[PDB]
Design a protein around this ligand. Structure first.
Ligand SMILES: [Zn+2]
Ligand SMILES: [Zn+2]
Ligand SMILES: [Zn+2]
Lengths: 115, 79, 59, 343, 65, 257, 44, 523
């Protein structure tokens, strides 16, 4: 009755934007990425990569409520750089990072099978 | 005049004045202060108290039967 | 009480303290030494009627 | 009977032993074997009533081993996400999806058509909108030609399950609807004749209750703890071997409103499961000791005190404090949120 | 009532192991020895077999409708 | 300002589980991938069950539910199949679901139990893992259990039955080089299998500078998806979700500009 | 409707306003076999 | 509009003022609202939703007072509303609710599950919704939780968080600061810049402290001689709490420093800043500490109860010495050597001497147990912070349970001069009279278990009657002072207008704003 559907955790609600970028006026060069229908599996993926970038001054994520299933990411960078670029560039590195891992795994998986 | 009650406004008076004003605002009552998009009626009345524009006049009944007419603007509110 | 088998067994062996003058004058709620091996000391409903209702010892 | 099933009651505080006596009765489980044939107003039967890993010798005589009223759980005592206070507990959502604590609920509805008055009498039939003048808005397609809903029909919300009308001096509907709004399926239908000889019938409505955040779970000793929050297997703190605890309880309960027997039972449960032997829960057996149990656990590549390194599900970094995890027996209490809200 | 399909903790299948577990017990094997043969290294799965009760045996005694 | 190269090697490969070590990887990526196996990995399991005749001792709800927990050997069929929501169907089709059936009847005096072998599936490849054997229920003489079931692709987070991982043993820094976990008495604690340390050394010396690396993975499968293929799908499944975020992210920037 | 005796477990058709008794036994308790309207079950 | 009672569950994410409510309960509950042009569209859409959809209206009231049910929706024109109407729209987010004569208001938040969520900082409850706007405004202005005023799961972690040992890496700091609502947006400079940045727990907590509030407190484990020593300002154990300009420069926080008391950070902030700022202080502490707790972690196990063999010998030696001493006292009374005190009789004097020997042993052995626990030990952490438990509880778990007194005395002779059949007749020894020399961990003897039950039974009976009697006093006191109030002439008068007090509290000051202090012109 009151139990929420199990698929709402990942399913995208109709007429709801998956990603919303909101600028923060507390400190210059700061933005909030309120992703929806995601969990900590995605929040930690980008936060760690953002820290690796020297041009990132402050990057982090948090969940307002586990049942909400929406994650908020706050990114702040240098005046020359932009939080939007940091979020975009970091994702590309992850895709490249996983591509090497996926490709290298396929290289080594056959090696063990044959011996 | 000759009013002996405290110049400050009690918390109970503040709550009732805002509540009554907020109810009035929700009933198509006019707003003295400028409207900058505040939809919620309580916010409209809250800034009215800050600007000292609420027409409500507080009549404090003394225990002896006498009453003192204290204006909301005259009373010193705490912000 | 058929909610659980253990509850059913306890109810059958359930005991009740005396009521009226006899129970009132005494202290049935308080645990006495004579209950050793005859009435379970730990088992007693919680609430106002604490110690009035007890359970027979296993043996 | 209720105190005998408690391991190490001497290690436990006296009020806790008394508290368990009340909780033990409220625990839900297989009360008897011939539950299907009988009809009871209230009857909770557990999906998987499993005998405990730690059992007392006197438990055999009570036959509680044959018909237990709880399911074991690998309980890690930690403060995870701060969702469990002194009276609370955190469950594993994935475990419940596999049947961790699910149980059935049976409510028996009973009615008879008796000729109390010569002019007016009760009958069993479909209350058609035309022949019946007074009626309540509800779906009547469930009822059959005999006025009794056949077994195997899903019933939800306000629905008529038995048709009864009174031929007042045109008939007035007086059927019986569901007591609550719970969704259930009728299990079996019984038609009989009462002692007076009038037709009398009983029907048992079966509903499935899935444990949720509002259900109250209680250990074998201590205060009952409501399921503060349910977390998926990924979010639960997994150990080195990949064993996400089924239940997480608040460590702050152990000091006062809980007993060291919970820790000892966890240690015994870990040894019992690892060594494949049911532990002895005799209250006054000098053979069983905390030090002896710790030594046995160390032989199976485990910490002598049962502490384990749990990796936080959200962040993979090791938790600074080593959590204490063990297979502690747990029982589900009759108090459930669904019953209260559905009312 | 009946052995669960899989371990509630991790998800390893344990229902199929129940049939072999009982068969090993009557084969003079120790309670813990049988678990090792079935391949239950984790203590969570060993719990599902070591201390399980098959209540359906007594229920099947009653005749059906 | 870019990511590293996650070198990966495999220790031992077997049917039940596969062990591999990933080096030069961030802790978040390794930890996230661990939960990607449990939830993100899609597998085919029974979700829709309808009973035509049930005379067994167990109840309709219990029997119908138990089928879902039974894993199905969906190695490559899961990839080609699609979720019911995104399909153009109002009723299950072979392209967005599969057909399952189980028609048994007990007439012998001896107790007969229906197991997963009697669970017939239209798709030859999509079959129960055992097909000893996953027993469903025990049937008495004169008891029959005829029902029809369907299975559909679903995420692990949606339900536990859609989780192919039978316990993931993820470990890192077994010797506690970075002191991420502090033991009051390190001597008592046992030595982990992956640790390379002497008997007389309780733990490795603390290094002032260092990062988590050389993550040890042991993915144990329930038989539905082979442990050597779950990793391939998980890595592709995680990144394809990451790319989807970028596509929506670009739209937001297009709106701001 | 068709009912089942609780002793012999045999089909016996009982109409409305008819005594409830098994011809083969005289047993006074009858049950209902099942409904032909099937329901939908979800493994949750 | 009384609602259906439902169980209570905790929710740290929710603010203390906020309350979680399920969709089903809120659907039944309705809040009459007067439609206005500024929100005419808002009511127009909600009424269109209908009762099937949760965000709907159960009834709509016209100016004439007629109520039209929205379940049927007979005509679209009837659905349309005019200005000045009253619409019983279903409860939504942001509404004010009041529940447990002083009641605290809350802001309702809709959550998926059924059970209510409360940010405690269990028992079923029913939440009441104020229909009228006037009382709704009044409730949110004076009856809110911030104006009415920490869990034990946080205080224990707060003490560990503020320890000097705790050091936070850049990655960890980012997560903690994200949950900080009252954050300026600038990351504080690390305490240890090189070789790597490392923020101390206090630095993160410094931002948690609102504004600039200064207070000095002491940790529970603060040696008395430390203050008199030269290291008073530089505490060797960090047992002194000092805050300057809102920054926790030093000291480990605990219930004494952070918990409610005459002088505490929460109390000082309430007077210095107010209630609204104080609530954020509670929320920030709960949220930030909970996230950090996932890294540090709090647990409990057998290792905490298992003490070193050295202390076990001392505990048994003290127990043995006490047992021998009791026998010596018994022998003296047996031979008539014992002399009764002038203020007591021989029988009562003997009971007093034996009680002190047993009572002293428990305290001495219990005190040694407290020193036995190491810093890493979880038992010490709870008591040191003072969150949950007590030093006596640890004593009964490790050292000794202690004497089991019944009705203020030792176990009475239920049988003829013997407490139990096993003990010899006229036995006044430790075991016979209920002295429990075995700790909970070790295990009690069969005789001790029954004696322990007798002591516990008395407590349960006293607790059962204590609540009944205490509750009666509360109701009685309220009735006799329900009409007592402070009038506009700064006088306390009842309904009859009789002067109870010329000035409230004899000074004319509120009891909440007053702060404890010691003027130094008399000592
Ligand atoms: Zn397992
Ligand atoms: Zn399709
Ligand atoms: Zn018959």
């Amino acid at each position: 009755m009151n139990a929420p559907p199990a698929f709402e955790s990942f399913l995208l609600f109709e007429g709801e934007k998956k990603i919303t970028i909101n600028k923060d006026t507390k400190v210059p060069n700061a933005c909030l990425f309120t992703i929806n229908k995601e969990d900590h599996t995605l929040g930690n993926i980008i936060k760690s990569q953002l820290l690796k970038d020297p041009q990132v001054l402050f990057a982090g994520y948090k969940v307002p409520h586990p049942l909400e299933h929406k994650i908020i990411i706050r990114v702040q960078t240098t005046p020359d750089y932009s939080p939007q670029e940091a979020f975009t560039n970091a994702i590309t590195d992850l895709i490249s990072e996983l591509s090497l891992l996926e490709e290298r795994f396929r290289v080594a998986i056959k090696d063990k099978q044959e011996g | 005049q000759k009013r002996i009650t405290t110049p400050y406004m009690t918390k109970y008076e503040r709550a009732r004045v805002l509540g009554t004003r907020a109810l009035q605002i929700a009933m198509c009552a006019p707003v003295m202060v400028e409207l900058e998009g505040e939809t919620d009626p309580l916010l409209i009345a809250m800034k009215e108290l800050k600007a000292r524009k609420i027409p409500i006049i507080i009549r404090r009944y003394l225990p002896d039967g006498s009453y003192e007419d204290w204006g909301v603007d005259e009373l010193i509110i705490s912000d | 009480n058929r909610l659980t088998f253990a509850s059913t067994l306890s109810h059958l062996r359930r005991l009740n303290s005396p009521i009226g003058r006899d129970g009132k004058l005494a202290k049935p709620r308080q645990l006495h030494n004579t209950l050793w091996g005859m009435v379970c000391p730990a088992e007693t409903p919680e609430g106002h009627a604490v110690g009035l209702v007890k359970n027979l010892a296993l043996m | 009977v209720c105190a005998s099933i408690i391991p190490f009651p001497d290690h436990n505080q006296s009020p806790r032993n008394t508290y368990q006596s009340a909780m033990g009765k409220q625990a839900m489980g297989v009360y008897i074997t011939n539950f299907h044939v009988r009809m009871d107003t209230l009857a909770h039967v557990l999906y998987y009533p499993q005998k405990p890993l730690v059992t007392t010798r006197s438990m055999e005589y009570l036959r509680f081993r044959e018909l237990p009223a709880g399911i074991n759980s690998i309980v890690a005592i930690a403060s995870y996400t701060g969702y469990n206070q002194e009276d609370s507990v955190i469950m594993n959502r994935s475990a419940v999806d596999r049947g961790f604590f699910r149980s059935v609920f049976y409510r028996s509805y009973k009615e008879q058509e008796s000729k109390k008055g010569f002019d007016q009498e009760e009958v069993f039939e479909k209350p058609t909108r035309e022949t019946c003048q007074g009626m309540r808005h509800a779906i009547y397609d469930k009822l059959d030609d005999d006025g009794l809903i056949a077994p195997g029909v899903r019933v939800s919300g306000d629905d008529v399950i038995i048709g009864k009308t009174v031929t007042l001096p045109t008939k007035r509907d007086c059927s019986t609807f569901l007591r609550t709004s719970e969704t259930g399926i009728v299990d079996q239908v019984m038609v009989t004749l009462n002692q007076e000889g009038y037709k009398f019938c009983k029907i048992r409505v079966r509903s499935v209750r899935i444990p949720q955040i509002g259900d109250k779970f209680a250990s074998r000793h201590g205060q009952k703890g409501t399921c503060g929050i349910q977390y998926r297997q990924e979010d639960m703190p997994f150990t080195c071997e990949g064993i996400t605890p089924d239940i997480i309880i608040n460590p702050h309960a152990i000091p006062s409103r809980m007993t060291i027997g919970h820790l000892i039972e966890c240690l015994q449960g870990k040894v019992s499961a690892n060594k494949g032997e049911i532990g002895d829960a005799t209250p006054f057996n000098d053979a069983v000791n905390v030090q002896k149990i710790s030594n046995l656990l160390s032989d199976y590549g485990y910490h002598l005190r049962g502490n384990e390194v749990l990796y936080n599900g959200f962040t993979g970094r090791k938790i600074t404090s080593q959590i204490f995890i063990g297979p502690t027996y747990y029982q589900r209490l009759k108090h459930m949120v669904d019953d209260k809200i559905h009312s | 009532m009946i052995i669960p399909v899989r371990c509630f903790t991790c998800g390893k299948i344990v229902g199929n192991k129940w049939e072999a577990y009982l068969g090993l017990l009557q084969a003079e094997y120790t309670e813990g020895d049988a678990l090792d043969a079935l391949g239950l290294k984790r203590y969570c799965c060993r719990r599902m077999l070591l201390a399980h009760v098959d209540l359906i045996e007594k229920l099947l005694n009653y005749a059906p409708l | 300002p870019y990511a590293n190269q996650p070198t990966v090697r495999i220790t031992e490969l077997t049917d039940e589980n596969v062990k591999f070590i990933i080096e030069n990887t961030d802790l978040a990526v390794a930890n996230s991938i661990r939960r990607v196996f449990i939830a993100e990995v899609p597998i085919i399991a029974i979700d829709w069950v309808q009973i035509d005749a049930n005379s067994s001792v167990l109840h309709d709800e219990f029997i119908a539910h138990r089928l879902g927990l039974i894993p199905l050997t969906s190695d490559d069929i899961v990839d080609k199949l699609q979720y019911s929501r995104d399909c153009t169907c109002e009723e299950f089709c072979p392209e967005c679901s599969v057909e399952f059936t189980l028609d048994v009847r007990c007439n012998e005096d001896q107790t007969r139990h229906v197991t997963s072998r009697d669970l017939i599936s239209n798709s030859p490849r999509v079959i129960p893992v055992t097909s000893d054997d996953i027993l469903i229920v025990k049937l008495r003489k004169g008891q029959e259990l005829r029902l029809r079931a369907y299975a559909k692709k679903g995420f692990g987070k949606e339900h536990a039955k859609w989780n192919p991982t039978a316990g993931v043993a993820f470990e890192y820094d077994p010797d506690n080089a970075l002191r991420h976990t502090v033991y009051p008495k390190p001597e008592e604690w046992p030595k982990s299998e992956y640790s390379e340390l002497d008997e007389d050394e309780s733990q490795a010396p603390y290094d002032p500078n260092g990062k988590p690396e050389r993550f040890y993975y042991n993915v144990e499968s329930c038989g539905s998806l082979r442990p050597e293929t779950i990793v391939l799908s998980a890595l592709s499944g995680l990144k394809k979700k990451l790319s989807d975020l970028q596509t929506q992210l670009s739209h937001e920037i297009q709106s701001d500009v | 409707m068709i009912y089942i005796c609780g002793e012999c477990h045999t089909e016996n058709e009982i109409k409305s306003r008819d005594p409830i008794r098994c011809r083969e036994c005289g047993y006074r308790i009858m049950y209902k076999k099942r409904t032909k309207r099937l329901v939908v079950f979800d493994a949750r | 509009d009384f609602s259906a009672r439902t169980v209570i569950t905790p929710d740290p994410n929710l603010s203390i003022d906020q309350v979680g409510v399920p969709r089903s309960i809120a659907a039944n509950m309705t809040f009459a609202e007067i439609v206005t042009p500024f929100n005419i569209d808002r009511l127009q859409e909600l009424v269109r939703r209908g009762n099937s959809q949760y965000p709907g209206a159960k009834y709509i009231i016209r100016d004439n007072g007629d109520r039209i049910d929205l379940r049927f929706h007979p005509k679209p024109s009837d659905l349309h509303l005019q200005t000045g109407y009253k619409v019983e729209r279903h409860m939504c987010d942001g509404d004010i609710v009041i529940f447990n004569m002083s009641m605290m208001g809350h802001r309702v938040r809709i959550l998926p599950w059924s059970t209510f969520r409360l940010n405690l900082s269990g028992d079923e409850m029913n939440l009441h919704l104020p229909q009228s706007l006037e009382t709704r405004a009044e409730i949110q202005e004076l009856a809110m939780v911030p104006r009415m005023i920490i869990v034990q799961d946080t205080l224990t972690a707060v003490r560990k968080f503020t320890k000097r040992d705790v050091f936070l890496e850049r990655g960890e700091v980012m997560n903690l600061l994200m949950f900080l609502s009252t954050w300026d947006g600038k990351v504080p400079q690390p305490a240890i810049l090189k070789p790597r940045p490392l923020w101390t727990g206090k630095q993160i907590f410094s931002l948690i402290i609102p504004g600039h509030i200064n207070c000095i407190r002491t940790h529970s484990t603060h040696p008395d001689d430390e203050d008199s020593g030269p290291y008073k300002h530089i505490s060797p154990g960090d047992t002194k709490v000092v805050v300057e300009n809102g920054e926790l420069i030093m000291g480990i926080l605990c219930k004494k420093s952070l918990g409610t008391s005459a002088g505490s950070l929460v109390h000082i902030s309430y007077l210095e800043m107010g209630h609204d700022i104080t609530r954020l202080f509670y929320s920030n502490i709960q949220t930030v500490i909970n996230n950090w707790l996932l890294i540090e972690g709090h647990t409990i196990g057998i290792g905490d109860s298992i003490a070193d063999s050295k202390t076990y010998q001392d505990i048994q030696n003290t127990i043995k010495k006490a047992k021998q001493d009791v026998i010596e006292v018994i022998e003296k009374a047996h031979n008539n050597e014992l002399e009764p005190t002038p203020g007591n009789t021989l029988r009562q004097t003997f009971e007093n001497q034996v009680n002190r020997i047993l009572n002293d042993a428990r305290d001495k052995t219990g005190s040694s147990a407290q020193k036995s626990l190491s810093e890493y030990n979880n038992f010490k952490s709870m008591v040191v912070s003072g969150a949950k438990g007590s030093k006596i509880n640890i004593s009964q778990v490790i050292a000794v349970v202690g004497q089991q007194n019944v009705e203020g005395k030792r176990i009475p002779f239920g049988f003829k001069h013997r407490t139990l059949p096993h003990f010899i007749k006229d036995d006044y020894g430790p075991e016979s009279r209920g002295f429990v020399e075995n700790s909970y961990l070790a295990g009690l003897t069969p005789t001790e278990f029954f004696f322990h039950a007798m002591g516990g039974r008395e407590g349960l009976i006293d607790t059962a009657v204590k609540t009944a009697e205490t509750g009666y006093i509360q109701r009685r006191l309220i009735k006799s002072m329900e009409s007592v109030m402070v009038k506009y002439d700064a006088t306390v008068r009842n309904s009859i207008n009789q002067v109870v007090q010329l000035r409230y509290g004899e000074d004319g000051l509120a009891g909440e704003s007053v702060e404890f202090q010691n003027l130094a012109t008399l000592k």
